[PDB]
Amino acid sequence: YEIMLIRPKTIDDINYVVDQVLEESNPVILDLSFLEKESPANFKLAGEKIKQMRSNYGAEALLLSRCNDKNLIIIAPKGVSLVRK
Amino acid sequence: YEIMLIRPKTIDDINYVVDQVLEESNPVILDLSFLEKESPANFKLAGEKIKQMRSNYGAEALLLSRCNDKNLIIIAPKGVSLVRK
Amino acid sequence: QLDDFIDGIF
Amino acid sequence: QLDDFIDGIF
């Protein structure tokens, strides 16, 4: 497979992540810092999409890093396990 | 596959990462902050192992985050593409 | 602004 | 202490 890397800025980027996780079954490493400070409405929307993916499709989501200008999340689809070691 | 998550502390943990990338073909998300401040010798060793993996085995390595107490790297084996979007 | 959509932290 | 073993930054 592939691991996609993105810093979402628009609703189209949020739909891009939904499609990689659910249609392509590709993990996505995404930085939510732009949405967080530019569009609080799209940041809430992005989070709702991640909640639905985990609740209904078995996706795992992990926070990797959280500092000024960075909010790194990894979303793995059902089929790719995030294994803590 | 699986994506392994580790904060290496010993040489055995460094050999663990070599084996996941090269034998299991699993990507590894690793935090090199412990080695960096506790064993500069093992931090250099860890970096040499990553250079050899990329040079001879086609592994990709990406820096995801670098702050106080964190140095997050992702190592993808030949077969898993890290795709910037 | 919590990340209340995660299953854990690295 | 550079990360001179990487192929790029996110």
Author numbering:
A (entry chain A), B (entry chain A): 65 to 149
C (entry chain B), D (entry chain B): 368 to 377
The study reports:
Here, we combine structural, cellular, and evolutionary analyses to demonstrate that SepF is the FtsZ anchor in the human-associated archaeon Methanobrevibacter smithii. M. smithii SepF binds to membranes and to FtsZ, inducing filament bundling. High-resolution crystal structures of archaeal SepF alone and in complex with the FtsZ C-terminal domain (FtsZCTD) reveal that SepF forms a dimer with a homodimerization interface driving a binding mode that is different from that previously reported in bacteria.
To further characterize the interaction between SepF and FtsZ, we crystallized MsSepFcore in complex with the FtsZCTD peptide and determined the structure of the complex at 2.7 Å resolution. The bound peptide is well-defined in the electron density for 10 out of 13 residues and adopts an extended conformation within a pronounced groove of the SepF monomer. The association is mediated by both hydrophobic and electrostatic interactions, the latter including 3 intermolecular ion pairs (FtsZ Asp 370 – SepF Arg 130, Asp 371 – Lys 115 and Asp 374 – Arg 118) and seven additional hydrogen bonds. Three of these H bonds are made by backbone atoms of the FtsZCTD peptide with the strand β3, partially extending the β-sheet. The archaeal-specific η1 insertion (residues 97-102) promotes the formation of a wider binding pocket compared to bacterial SepF and is involved in a network of hydrogen bonding interactions that contributes to stabilize the FtsZ-SepF complex. Furthermore, despite their evolutionary distance and sequence divergence, the structures of bacterial and archaeal SepF-FtsZ complexes share a partially conserved mode of interaction for the N-terminal part of the FtsZCTD (residues LDDFI in MsSepF and DLDV in CgSepF), which binds to a similar groove formed between α2 and β3 in the SepF monomer. However, the binding modes of the C-terminal half of FtsZCTD are markedly different between Archaea and Bacteria. In fact, in C. glutamicum this region interacts with residues from the two monomers of the SepF functional dimer at the α-helical interface, while in M. smithii it largely binds to only one monomer of the functional dimer, enlarging the monomer-peptide interface surface (600 Å2) with respect to that observed in C. glutamicum (390 Å2). In M. smithii, only the terminal residue of FtsZCTD (Phe377) binds to a surface hydrophobic pocket in the second SepF monomer at the β-sheet dimer interface. But a notable difference is the wider and deeper binding cleft of the FtsZ binding pocket in MsSepF formed between α2 and β3 through the archaeal-specific conserved η1 insertion. This results in a more important interaction of the FtsZCTD with the SepF monomer in Archaea than in Bacteria and could point towards an ancestral binding mode where a single monomer of SepF might have been sufficient for FtsZ binding.
